[PDB]
A paper describes a structure:
Thymidylate synthase (TS) is a highly conserved protein found through all kingdoms of life including human, mouse, bacteria, protozoa and some viruses. It catalyzes the transfer of the methylene group from cofactor 5,10-methylenetetrahydrofolate (mTHF) to substrate deoxyuridine monophosphate (dUMP).
The structure of TSVZV in complex BVDUP was also determined by soaking BVDUP with crystals of the second crystal form. A molecule of PEG 400, that is likely to be contributed by the crystallization buffer, is also found in the active site. It binds to BVDUP and is located in the TSVZV active site where the folate binds. The 5-bromovinyl substituent on BVDUP stretches towards and binds the hydrophobic patch on the active site that is lined by amino acids Tyr 100, Ile 122, Tyr 123, Leu 180 and Pro 182. The O3’ of the pentose sugar in BVDUP is hydrogen-bonded to His 244 and Tyr 246 but that in dUMP only interacts with Tyr 246. The distance between the thiol group atom on Cys 183 to C6 of the pyrimidine ring in dUMP and BVDUP decreased from 3.4 Å to 3.0 Å respectively. Even in the absence of the folate cofactor and the C-terminal loop, BVDUP appears to be held in a closed conformation by the additional hydrophobic interactions contributed by its 5-bromovinyl substituent.
Numbering used by the authors:
A (entry chain B): 12 to 295
B (entry chain A): 14 to 98, 116 to 293
The structure:
Amino acid sequence: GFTLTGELQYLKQVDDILRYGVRKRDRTGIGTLSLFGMQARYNLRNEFPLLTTKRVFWRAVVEELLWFIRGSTDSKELAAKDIHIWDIYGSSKFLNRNGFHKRHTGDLGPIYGFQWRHFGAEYKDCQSNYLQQGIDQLQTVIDTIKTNPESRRMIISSWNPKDIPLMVLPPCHTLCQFYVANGELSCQVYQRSGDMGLGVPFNIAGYALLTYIVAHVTGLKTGDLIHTMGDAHIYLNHIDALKVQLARSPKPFPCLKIIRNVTDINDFKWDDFQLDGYNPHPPL
Amino acid sequence: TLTGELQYLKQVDDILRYGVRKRDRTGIGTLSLFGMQARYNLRNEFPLLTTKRVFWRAVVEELLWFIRGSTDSKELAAKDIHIWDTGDLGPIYGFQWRHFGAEYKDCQSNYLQQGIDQLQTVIDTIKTNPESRRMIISSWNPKDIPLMVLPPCHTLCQFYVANGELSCQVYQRSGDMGLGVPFNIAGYALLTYIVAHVTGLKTGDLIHTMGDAHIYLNHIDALKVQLARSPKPFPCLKIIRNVTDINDFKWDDFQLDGYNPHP
Ligand SMILES: O=c1[nH]c(=O)n([C@H]2C[C@H](O)[C@@H](COP(=O)(O)O)O2)cc1/C=C/Br
């Protein structure tokens, strides 16, 4: 291979946004450097693509995925586990200032988890029960992988325009596609908007984890994660930090082991995962 | 740092040299690679492949068929274009582009003001919030998919403005390099030209992303021939009339110059 992969390509990406990126006025008010249309390959064979040049909150990644898997959209459940990444959007101050004054605290609307397990259902609130409503994208993929893995139609999309106005924020990782070859599960994720500073390393971990999880329950080996994105951007108030992180040579990716033989997609716990060798670089 | 049609050709070559044995949905064998991407420049050129003649008139008429939200294949046959061959194809691209989330009945029923007009929405957003990262047209509707004759290959696309130029990245889940992909490239390259013209913007890049990029085992020889050929300079597409309405485009409004494909 003469083309970069893994954390080298990620760093290759932030570098290009730093030299060729375009300054644009962002929704949040603060400016960003932007490039459009990127793609990075992350090998999943015998290693886990958890970025090492700066520490990734691994436990939040795990809990958020299981939070997606159970169809949940109540940020309080994450905060009940000291995972406060969605707390801002669940907070009462945000909900009222953004037209969601009738919704109760934590109600994130029809976010990822809802679209994953019940796409098409009419959303009520994060407390409601929606079982056997909508379309279970996650479970149809698992069924298709077991029945007809040659399929090129194994996709999970969160982009529901009809439900989007109810969402606190449009799905950044809009969809992913699974792919099976040589009894080896692969997964490409399309990310419409990717903040290189915060979200992108967090998402890469999640969809790598998701591929590991699905490949687990389907008896398949993990192939590759392909991280495709649209508006690849770097917030201007992060440039100084990203250039310091840029000089760090990334360490060997860690191992991921599942200590239990989970057969049910909903039956995964935080205590099921073993991460060996994660020795990221010291903070700023 | 590989430009133009050579991007497509290297992709073809890679799936032949590095491609994986994977079975097609119909039973035939294919060579496959998961995850690819190509950047086609739209500045003073149009990425219509030259190493093989592409059905230019169906690219245009199908798009204008998508734009007016038609799911009737008889509408394309009425212009001697039968690439979709009574009539009712189910809630395909046209119904998803203009009426996403509406209740589909048949190809003759009316869906105006029903569902969500993604196409006009991204148009409005370009004139209003060109810095938006949410300008997306998705054709993937798990609800309506079992009623489609064929699931959408081009799942979605995202538009992007920078320095007055309009760029589009399209996600194609499944790419037959032998036939589909070339027709598809020009399909979304043409789309960018249309939305740019309406919005008054320039044309940036078509970013072409693929999932299962594959080659059928019949087409190997016929692609080994095409790869032997030398690429030729891309044509120049000119929108000859000043159209303001996305629905006001006709075949006569397009002038394709300098297209010299191989036999
Ligand atoms: O636009 C296209 N481009 C393409 O390559 N193809 C090709 C891609 C693939 O071989 C086949 C689609 O079958 P599945 O992937 O669903 O099993 O047709 C098809 C289309 C039309 C889609 Br409607």
